[PDB]
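Chapter review. Work through the record for Cytochrome P450 2C9 before attempting the end-of-chapter questions.
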Amino acid sequence: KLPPGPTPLPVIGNILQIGIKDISKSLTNLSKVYGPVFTLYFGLKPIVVLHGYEAVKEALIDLGEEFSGRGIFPLAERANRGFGIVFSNGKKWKEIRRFSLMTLRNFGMGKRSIEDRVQEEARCLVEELRKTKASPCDPTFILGCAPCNVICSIIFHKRFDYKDQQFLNLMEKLNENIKILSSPWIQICNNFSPIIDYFPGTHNKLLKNVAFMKSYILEKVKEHQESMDMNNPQDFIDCFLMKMEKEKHNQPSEFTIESLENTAVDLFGAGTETTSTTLRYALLLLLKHPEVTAKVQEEIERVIGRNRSPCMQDRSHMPYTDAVVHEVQRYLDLLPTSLPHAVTCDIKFRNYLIPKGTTILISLTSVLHDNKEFPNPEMFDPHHFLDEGGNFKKSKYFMPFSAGKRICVGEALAGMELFLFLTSILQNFNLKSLVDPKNLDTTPVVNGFASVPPFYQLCFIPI
Ligand code: HEM
Ligand SMILES: CCCCc1nc(Cl)c(CO)n1Cc1ccc(-c2ccccc2-c2nn[nH]n2)cc1
Ligand SMILES: CCCCc1nc(Cl)c(CO)n1Cc1ccc(-c2ccccc2-c2nn[nH]n2)cc1
Ligand SMILES: [K+]
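Structure tokens for Cytochrome P450 2C9:
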């Protein structure tokens, strides 16, 4: 049958007993009772939860194809959210994902590499930092721009100026949708009502914000159709139009202008907020543990010097910095339950049978915070990624990107962003707090699965 769970009440399921304030903890509490595989009910739709490395691994990896579905919630439909990569399934997903991974290969869109676009953004980020002239500063915004401009460059070949109103407009919409999408009312509560949309104004705001962004993308597309050069694809859209020309005589086809739009919005969405937030917390953690900072800096000075930019080759000569970046992601656990999965067919799992179409919830927390792979997993300590001689120590428990067939598409892109932005900031600046290090809180604030950092200010002191 289904794995066992705590008894649900007719209709509301186990709903009125979950800590919507911190679902992760709730899951972890239950696991304390029902073990690593347990069942829950969300107003009648069963959801199997997987907790702990073993169960996540043999699910996502060993039965990878079977667990490769994306769980669908009303919201997916309420915000027209299932038409690109993140919220797709079947043929559509496989085709668009696979093509998207090929095109975001470092050298997948022409002679200009992804690393080179990031490298440029690292320089612009540092310039903007300088322009603050060491005065206090809330970097929430700037750190939001950098990644966004990276997605822009990957998709439009254009980067913007931190003050180009056009950019500032896009950011705003992005930021609005993100903040909205992050409300518990929208993520959870509204997904109890499968038929009735209880927040129509909101979904309407979301959709309008989407339309503005799709409409802007469609302008770029036109500009790209007129300037096409079949031997010199320069960005994601180029590649996507070329794949379209190849699918001519393969209709109906997954690749259309509609899907390009939807895929591009997914990319803007997914490639801007999580990185941005990871960087924003990273700076905060570095203010709090300034001996970590000084160690990153000793590595940078010695391996990279100050003449040139950091580049990805340096990361292998910088085991301590790399440990720092890993540990930031492990410690933050920014997507504690990944995104929802669904089984792709009827399956046997351990003692139990899971019927095709059942939502699966992966507790990334339980892997990231394994208190044996990572002693005192709730403390920030880069030593969790270092061996006895201060060499880099990999961990099969390092899944901030999830695992298996759905592993984040931006995994390599996030990794370049973090390493190059962080090392470029710390190459050109020291960090200074207002309040005393040993004072401010670095523990993630969390909501509707939402993980945000407190407000804080700091100064960027030129080196
Ligand atoms: C630190 C930054 C990031 C983290 C921690 C992160 C993490 C994740 C996670 C946990 C998933 C869900 C995997 C699952 O379905 O089980 C995911 C999916 C995804 N991420 Fe990221 N991500 C990050 C940045 C990015 C970036 C920069 C992009 C750029 C394109 C991106 C694009 C995606 C996409 C498209 C998916 C959907 C994959 C699919 O369902 O096939 N992410 N990410
Ligand atoms: C109905 C079509 C209007 C669409 C829309 N475009 C934008 Cl732009 C605005 C700003 O509020 N809006 C309206 C708006 C109205 C109230 C909400 C909202 C805010 C907080 C808590 C619940 C509500 C809500 N949403 N739907 N019903 N009540 C959000 C969007
Ligand atoms: C102006 C456009 C902003 C981005 C955007 N707004 C809308 Cl509505 C969509 C539909 O998915 N999207 C695409 C989307 C894809 C992934 C996310 C995402 C980003 C960081 C952290 C969590 C999520 C998320 N979205 N849903 N569940 N988790 C946000 C937006
Ligand atoms: K209303």
